[PDB]
Amino acid sequence: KKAIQDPAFSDGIRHVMDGSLPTSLKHIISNAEYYGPSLFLLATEVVTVFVFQEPSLLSSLQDNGLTDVMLHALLIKDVPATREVLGSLPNVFSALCLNARGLQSFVQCQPFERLFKVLLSPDYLPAMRRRRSSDPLGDTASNLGSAVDELMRHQPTLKTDATTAIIKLLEEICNLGRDPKYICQKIPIPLMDYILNVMKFVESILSNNTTDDHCQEFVNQKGLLPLVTILGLPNLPIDFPTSAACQAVAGVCKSILTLSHEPKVLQEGLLQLDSILSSLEPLHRPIESPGGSVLLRELACAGNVADATLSAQATPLLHALTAAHAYIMMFVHTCRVGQSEIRSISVNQWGSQLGLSVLSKLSQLYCSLVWESTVLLSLCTPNSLPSGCEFGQADMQKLVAMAARIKQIKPLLSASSRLGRALAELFGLLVKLCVGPAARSTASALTKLLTKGLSWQPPPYTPTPRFRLTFFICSVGFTSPMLFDERKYPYHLMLQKFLCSGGHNALFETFNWALSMGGKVPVSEGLEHSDLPDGTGEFLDAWLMLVEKMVNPTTVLESPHSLPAKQFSALRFLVVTQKAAFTCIKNLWNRKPLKVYGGRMAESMLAILCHILRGEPVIRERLSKEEEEAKCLEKFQDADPLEQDELHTFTDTMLPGCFHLLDELPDTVYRVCDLIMTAIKRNGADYRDMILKQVVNQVWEAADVLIKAALPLTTSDTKTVSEWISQMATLPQASNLATRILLLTLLFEELKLPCAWVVESSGILNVLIKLLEVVQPCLQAAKEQKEVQTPKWITPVLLLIDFYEKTAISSKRRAQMTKYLQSNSNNWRWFDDRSGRWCSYSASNNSTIDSAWKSGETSVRFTAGRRRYTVQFTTMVQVNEETGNRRPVMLTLLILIQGLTEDMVTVLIRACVSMLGVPVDPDTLHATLRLCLRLTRDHKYAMMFAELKSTRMILNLTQSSGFNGFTPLVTLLLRHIIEDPCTLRHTMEKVVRSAATSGAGSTTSGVVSGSLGSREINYILRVLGPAACRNPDIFTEVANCCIRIALPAPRGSGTASDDEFENLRIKGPNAVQLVKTTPLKPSPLPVIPDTIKEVIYDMLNALASKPLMPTSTILRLLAELVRSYVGIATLIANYSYTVGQSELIKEDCSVLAFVLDHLLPHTQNAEDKDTPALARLFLASLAAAGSGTDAQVALVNEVKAALGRALAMAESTEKHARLQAVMCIISTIMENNIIRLFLKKGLVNDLARVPHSLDLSSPNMANTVNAALKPLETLSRIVNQNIPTTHPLMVRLSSIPTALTRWTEECKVLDAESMHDCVSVVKVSIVNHLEFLRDEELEERREKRRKQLLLDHEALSCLLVLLFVDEPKLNTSRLHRVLRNLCYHAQTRHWVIRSLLSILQRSSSWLSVSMDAALGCRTNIFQIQTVHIHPQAAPVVCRHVLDTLIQLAKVDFWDLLVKLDNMEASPLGQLMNMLSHPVIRRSSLLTEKLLRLLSLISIGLTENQLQLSVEVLTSEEGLEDAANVLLQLSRGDSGTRDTVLKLLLNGARHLGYTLCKQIGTLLAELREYNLEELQLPSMSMLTSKTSTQKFFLRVLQVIIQLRDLSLDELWDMLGECLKELEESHDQHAVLVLQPAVEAFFLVHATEQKFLRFAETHRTVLNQILRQSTTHLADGPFAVLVDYIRVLDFDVKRKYFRLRKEDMAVHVRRDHVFEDSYRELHRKSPEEMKNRLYIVFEGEEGQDAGGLLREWYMIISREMFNPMYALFRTSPGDRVTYTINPSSHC
Amino acid sequence: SLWDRFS
Secondary structure, eight states: OTTTTSTTSTTTGGGTTTSSHHHHHHHHHHTTTTSOHHHHHHHHHHHHHHHHHOGGGHHHHHHTTHHHHHHIIIIISOOOOSHHHHHHHHHHHHHHGGGSHHHHHHHHTOHHHHHGGGGGOGGGHHHHSOSTTTSOTTHHHHHHHHHHHHHHHHOGGGHHHHHHHHHHHHHHHHHHHHSTTOEEOOOEEOHHHHHHHHHHHHHHHHSSSOOSHHHHHHHHTTOHHHHHHGGGOTTSOTTTTTSHHHHHHHHHHHHHHHHHOOTHHHHHHHHHHHHHHTTOGGGTSOOSSSOOOHHHHHHHTSTTOTTGGGOTTTOHHHHHHHHHHHHHHHHHHHHSOOOHHHHHHHHHHHTSHHHHHHHHHHHHHHHHHHHHHHHHHHHHSOSSSSOSOOSSHHHHHHHOOOHHHHHHHHHHHHHHHHHHHHHHHHHHHHHHHHHOOOHHHHHHHHHHHHHHHHHOOOOTTOSSTHHHHHHHHHHHHHHHHHHBOTTSOBBHHHHHHHHHSSSHHHHHHHHHHHHHTTTTSOHHHHTTOTTOOTTHHHHHHHHHHHHHHHHOHHHHTTOTBOOOOOOOOHHHHHHHHHHHHHHHHHTTSSSOOOSSSSHHHHHHHHHHHHHHHHHHHHHHHHHHHOOHHHHHHHHHHSOOOOOHHHHHHHHHHOHHHHHHHHHHOGGGHHHHHHHHHHHHHHSOHHHHHHHHHHHHHHHHHHHHHHHHTTSOOOSOSSOSSHHHHHHHHHSHHHHHHHHHHHHHHHHHHHSHHHHHHHHHHTOHHHHHHHHHHHHHHHHHHHHHHTOOOOOTTHHHHHHHHHHHHHHHHHHHHHHHHHTTSOSSSOOEEEEETTTTEEEEOOHHHHHHHHHHHHTTOSEEEEEETTEEEEEETTTTEEEETTTOOEEEEEEOOOOOOOOOOHHHHHHHHHHHHHHHHTTOOHHHHHHHHHHHHHHTTSHHHHHHHHHTTHHHHHHHOBGGGOOTTHHHHHHHHHHHHHOOHHHHHHHHHHHHHHHHHSOOOOTTOOOTTOSSGGGBHHHHHHHTHHHHHHOHHHHHHHHHHHEEEOOOOOSSSOTTTHHHHHHHHHTSSSOOOBEEEOOOOOOOOOOOOHHHHHHHHHHHHHTOOOBSSOHHHHHHHHHHHHHHOHHHHHHHHHOBOOTTSSTTOOSSOBHHHHIIIIISSOOSSOSSTTHHHHHHHHHHHHHHSOOTTTTHHHHHHHHHHHHHHHHHSOSSHHHHHHHHHHHHHHHHHHOOHHHHHHHHTTHHHHHHTTGGGSOTTOTTHHHHHHHHHHHHHHHHHHHHOOOOSSOTTTOOOTTSOOHHHHHHHHHHHHOTTTHHHHHHHHHHHHHHHHHHHHHHHHHHHHHHHHHOOOSOHHHHHHHHHHHHSOOTTSOHHHHHHHHHHHTTSHHHHHHHHHHHHHHHHHHOOOOOOEEOOSSSOOEESEEEOOEEEOTTTHHHHHHHHHHHHHHHHHOOHHHHHHHHHHOOOSTHHHHHHGGGSHHHHHOHHHHHHHHHHHHHHHOOHHHHHHHHHHHHHOOHHHHHHHHHHHHHHHHHOHHHHHHHHHHHHHHHHHHHHHHHHHHHHHHHHHHHHHOOOOOOGGGHHHHSTTOHHHHHHHHHHHHHHHHOOOOHHHHHHHHHHHHHHHHSSOSGGGGGGHHHHHHHHHHSSOOOHHHHHHHHTHHHHHHHHHHOOSOTTTSGGGGGGSOGGGSOHHHHHHHHOOOOOEEEEEEOTTTHHHHHHHHHTTSOHHHHTSEEEEEETTOOOOOHHHHHHHHHHHHHHHTTOGGGOSEEOOTTTSSSOEEOTTTTO | OOSTTTO
16 A cells, blocks of 8 residues: 555556456455454555556456455445444545446445445444544544545535435434334434434535535435434434434534525424424413323323333323424524524524414413423422422322432423423524514514513412412513623614513513512512512512613613614603603512512612613603504503602602611612712702711711720629620621711712711711720720621721721812812823824813813713724823724813821821731721821821831731732831831932833833833823822922933024024923933932831841741842832841740841741741742842942852851751752842952852862762852853732732832822822922923023043862762763863963863872772772772763863863862873873773864874874774864874875775785685585674774775875785675675775776776676765766766666756647647757646546656557557567658658 | 523
């Protein structure tokens, strides 16, 4: 098979099938049971591949009947049942048909009737089973189908018969599904496996190329009936419709629909569905007696059959249900189609007379199945739901103690439930298709279903009302998806038909019925009645959730799914809906809530009220602006609008109910705020005030009663321990506050200033602060009980206070902003970063933006150039709605809330720290820390917060008392404590300078490192806004002192004219005020206050149920602190611990020394996991912080001392860990003054001398040495070269963060949108100063114009000792780089190189480097008695030293070494002399490395002779290296050229003489072998890889390579021996002289004896060349180009073997000879040399190589057709051909 | 998802 598919047989493969081969393939194919199936497949595949390489010779395969045996073995005889054979049969038939005669024979024998029988046979099911449980279901059926599809696509005549056989398979499935005698297994028959495989097959066949020719043929041959009938098959199982087989049938039908656009698939399904729905009408008819389910009266009455549900006669209605389910799982699949045309034909089919007959019967089926499912479910319930009645018991007594009945009922109910689910999916998707003429009737029938479900009433015998309520819930559950889309927008067609047809009056009648219980109780009393049915809350939850969607004007009016204009009004629909809903809500407004489903009821009821209260404005405005279908719509058009006087009185009286809901169901409070807000936005401030004052009076009394609840318990009447502590948390007042405060806070957040002024004027803040002060003792006690239980009302209060002072801040900032703005035509301007201009908006845009900003809207929309822009005043960004480009904006500048007074702040801070002491709760800690963060932004209060020892509490906090934002927030608080006026000033200077100097990027598309946009003062102040908010006064002082507006160069000299326009330009209203920094003023370091040092020290001590601030967190925080503030770095570096301050402390030691020693090293037992990395971060921060010498010098000194300590440590894993960690710190810190210090401190020396103070034999030595080399390498080179925005209750290294980012986050949290107001006040203040200074500097400028040895020997020795030791894990490469970087220094280079050479020579207790050199003995590398290397170790020391020397080349020691243990071109001579020394001369490896070194360096008599001896007696690499060395040296000198050539010639002569002393033995032994194959032992010493032949050839090659020797006796011997060898039988016997023969040609035939030898050895030189791939005309044998008789044919063929294009040749199959003559005979030779591809007119495509070969074959035949008279057969031979002497005709 | 009550 491979050869047939391979060239080099394509010429000649025709003669495979005229051999015996087909007679043996015929037997393998004929005996697929004796030979394996794999072998059968292989044989068929071979024939197939031959038939595709040479289809002509398919006729020969037909002549000998191999194809006729294949047909019989693949069709008539049983196919061997395996995946590959089935997968291959159609490709075989694609071959056997290829001759047209084969096609006839193939179609003669009914091939597809046999081939497709495979799919209905259990013998082949194991072949069909998915392989690996990974490939698709039916993968083998799909593959077979695709193969058959290809076969038909090539041979279209078969299409008609294939689909004829396909329909027969479907028909056969139907028969095996129709008769009773078979039973589907999971007589048993695998009907679902057959169905699945057939459907996957027919899917591939029908829909592969999407040609639609197969779909059309199949549909026109009536195959869709047999297809769609498979769904309805009686004996298919109950679980069929959900199964893969059903999906496969649906997939086939969908494929037909999509690929044919044919309605016929749905029509027939509907016909059969209509047939099935008509069968199960007994499901619609109830018992008409005390009775339960019809399914359970058909089951129970099925005699005593063990499994009735498995028989279609035992359970006709259940099997019919499953048939319906199968049909309905196909219409779902065909509706899930996005082609508007397929969708349109789906709608058309559904809206037909048959479509609507089916849809009516499906609607009645739906209501029957909801009834039956709720009955069977209630019967399966364990005698709880029914009222002790024989409702369905009479049939359960036939069915049958409880488990068995429930376990028979359960299958039935799973059939009903799943059918219903599928049918609801169909109706829902049909609504989508209907919406997006016949659609209108489909929607009519679906809304008639909705009406039927809502107005359905059960039989009077129903035992309990819960059967109707559970029906109603499902009905209400079903109308909501069908009236409203996902995203809650309605379909106006469906609302139209739901209104006109009915279902709105029935929806609200179902509400009235559910509350009144059928009229037993009025609706206004129903909800509160004790005997309300159990399921009336679930119904009312679903009803309210539906009506919430129905009432919302923002979706009912704005729905994308509106009808077109030409009639429905959504306005009158909302009028009638809001009017109907309001009364029902009245009937539920204030009554107490239900046990379950009472908070969802309340929340949807409040949402309905909100929508109504918002809508009656909009609805009234639009109302003012303003056969059956028309009549009903007109009736509902005359709809009374909901009275405006009724919503008024409602909003008046609603608050008692709102507060009842807040007492019963706190979680509703978020919707009550919104309800109150809409009533407020309906009514005036006179109503806002009444609301807020009433809420505040509720808070007031609840707070004053809790203040009276916590008076200290002097008299002991109550327990005073458990009761008082839990009374604060559990009194009703303390449940009220938790919602009255939260409501007041939400109201405050919306109504910012009215509610601020009311909270101020009520004094409620005083009372709340007093209550906070009073609670603290109770909390502390509880902590002393170890039973803290936090009063939940604490978090609302702190949040209220938070938003009160946020609000006061902003108003003051806004007030002084208003004081600096004209209220008329405030100019908004948008920033052009590219030009740097604040360009104005149009007047209409400016007025719109201003008006909507003044309203306080978060965003404003406007259009410019038809582009849509929106501004976001949270961010002050204009977004282009098309592109999303965000651009900055500004406002161009030209009820006073006192806020929390000093006493309040002091008390609040004390209460906060008390709450931090007792870990009150996560959310309460979050609120109190947020409040502290807002308060402590004044340093006075940060000092207060830090003097009460709160950082200790914060460090003590456990993970039980932690929250997402804890560590950010704590970091910000600590920064607020650290930022004293002076440290804040210096840090603000740093931030301002950094931001002005660096063109920072932003989320406003401000180009990074821009020079226009990134540098404007008006933008930089916007970036620095967080800094202005941090402290505006200090920020003014800093910006006035550190900023100056730039002066642009003098445009033109001359005062009269140029300066007039330079004042016009620089000072113009529209200008580009770029910024320059002032030169740095020599700021002194701010002295750190002592309390800030009792804050920093407590964290440093915290370095020394899990803790919430572990060491890792503290280290990160400290790193940030050090990065931002340099005082912190100096303090930490100076700091030191004290004896017995912590368990880990042994004596007075620095913080840094501890971090390096105790925390930094990796240790296998965790305390905190990532402490090492963060400690590394901390130390890197401390180093990077310049801090002059205070931090850097201390750090370097401590690192050094730490290295020393780790060294002197006793040998242990702990020492190694410490050392490695310290080296990593050094590397990190290094990666420039720190490097200056490392040099000054001698850290390079210590690192190098690390070896000395380590064990060389330790296992962990290589890792620590690698670690110490890493900074040595770097240093030698360098020398010698979270925060949640809103509290959860309210709502519904460069890794180190910079100071500006922290301030930004703080600003966001504390004051999200009020930052800009400050940026503006500060901007005005600053600019009124910087422009003055710009004009003064400009005047000054005009006036001035008008007036006009790294390492010492010892350390290097230790490095060489590392070079000596044998450690695989040791990074030799790193050591080599270190040594090279050290050897850039000349003195160091000299010492190193010389020492290495001395080590080499000598090669040929700390120093106890034992090496496992030998099997029995471990040898010490150093024998010290004057230091010797044990000769067993020498080859290793040599190897390492040679590597090092090669690296240096690419770019005393002993006495020092014992002093330790007791505690290019000049040395080329020595290296060459080392070739003589035995350890090197033995080893191939060492010799090669030495030769490599010599070659690299190369870029006297004895030394050159040593080199020549190497090649003479020994490594292809070594050979090349020796050649290079000799060549380069020869180029070095002429006298050395001569001496080397002489020595090489002498070596060659000696080698030849020894060779001749070998060939003489060979010849003699060949004489003695013959004179009485060749394995003469004399041949062995020529076969040898190291034979003198090899050496001789190598030497000769080098001699020639130098040319730009008397050996006639050897030549004669070689000749004689070759002749004797050739005389012998064996041919390859010559090859043992190939190298010597090569040598002869190398010597002779200089760039003749050679020719004579080659002739007398012709077949030998041919064996040479034939074996050689050396190209004849580039090697030495080129000379014989001209004497050609001396080569073999195939040698000359190998030697033998214009841009060329591809080129077409158009010829006719019947004229090829003459068509080619016409096309080509005038073509040029170079056009012929193009690659020809042949096209035969109208013939199919074929292999161009095969088509050319065929063309050549036909031509080579026609040459010898007598009709052309070109060639005639020799009258003697009669098979040859010569020129026809009769071609003159 | 409204028929989950039976299942």
